[PDB]
């Protein structure tokens, strides 16, 4: 399903560790699939995300909110990737046609490892029209 895409391609372990939680979410707000411990994702939050891709940097004041949790905005890519820093851990959000790929990492996992996994899947879904 969309679960296979979350279980195999996002929550798969690189070296030792893996992401804390991950999800593929319609730009509408509709979960396509999530991992066991991905937070319910307030509607106010999904908006803030979607409209930061349309007009880059819109989110910067309030910052990336995912399931109540505040993440400071790191360098993203303009209209493609949004990145979030919360102490050692963080989050990456990669935009598709229809959807968002979201990964959330905690140390000892790196931003790099999170970026790899989230953006790679993203670019696949884009290739496929999603």
């Amino acid at each position: 399903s969309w679960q296979v895409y979350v279980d195999e391609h996002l929550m798969c372990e690189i070296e030792g560790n893996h992401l804390t939680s991950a999800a593929i979410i319609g730009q509408d707000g509709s979960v396509w699939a999530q991992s066991q411990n991905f937070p319910q994702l307030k509607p106010e939050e999904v908006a803030g995300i979607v409209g930061d891709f349309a007009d880059p940097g819109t989110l910067a004041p309030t910052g990336l909110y995912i399931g109540g949790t505040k993440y400071m905005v790191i360098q993203g890519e303009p209209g493609a990737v949004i990145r979030g820093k919360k102490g050692p851990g963080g989050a990456t959000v990669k935009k598709t046609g229809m959807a968002l790929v979201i990964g959330i990492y905690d140390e000892p996992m790196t931003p790099g490892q999170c970026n790899m996994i989230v953006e790679r899947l993203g670019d696949y879904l884009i290739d496929q029209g999603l």
Side-chain angles (χ1 to χ4, degrees), residues 1-119 121-130:
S1 166
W2 281 112
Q3 199 65 50
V4 170
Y5 283 84
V6 166
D7 299 348
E8 300 293 61
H9 297 303
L10 291 181
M11 294 301 288
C12 66
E13 59 161 5
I14 175 167
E15 296 169 346
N17 50 45
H18 60 286
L19 291 63
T20 305
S21 73
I24 304 179
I25 312 285
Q27 285 177 31
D28 62 64
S30 300
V31 172
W32 286 9
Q34 49 183 50
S35 75
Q36 256 177 324
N37 292 295
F38 185 88
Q40 300 316 286
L41 177 67
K42 286 153 180 160
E44 182 180 292
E45 294 179 341
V46 174
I49 278 156
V50 168
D52 188 43
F53 292 121
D55 201 337
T58 307
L59 202 64
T62 58
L64 183 61
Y65 281 99
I66 317 182
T69 309
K70 185 179 173 264
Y71 296 90
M72 293 274 279
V73 169
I74 284 161
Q75 200 173 63
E77 289 174 35
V81 187
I82 284 156
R83 306 188 221 236
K85 204 41 161 186
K86 174 160 216 283
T92 313
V93 178
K94 164 68 153 163
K95 175 211 166 291
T96 76
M98 307 186 71
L100 311 176
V101 188
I102 295 181
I104 302 195
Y105 71 95
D106 289 345
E107 65 163 349
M109 187 162 163
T110 75
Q113 281 165 3
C114 180
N115 296 325
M116 175 182 174
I117 291 163
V118 172
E119 302 177 38
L121 187 57
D123 284 327
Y124 181 56
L125 301 191
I126 290 167
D127 163 57
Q128 292 210 288
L130 304 169

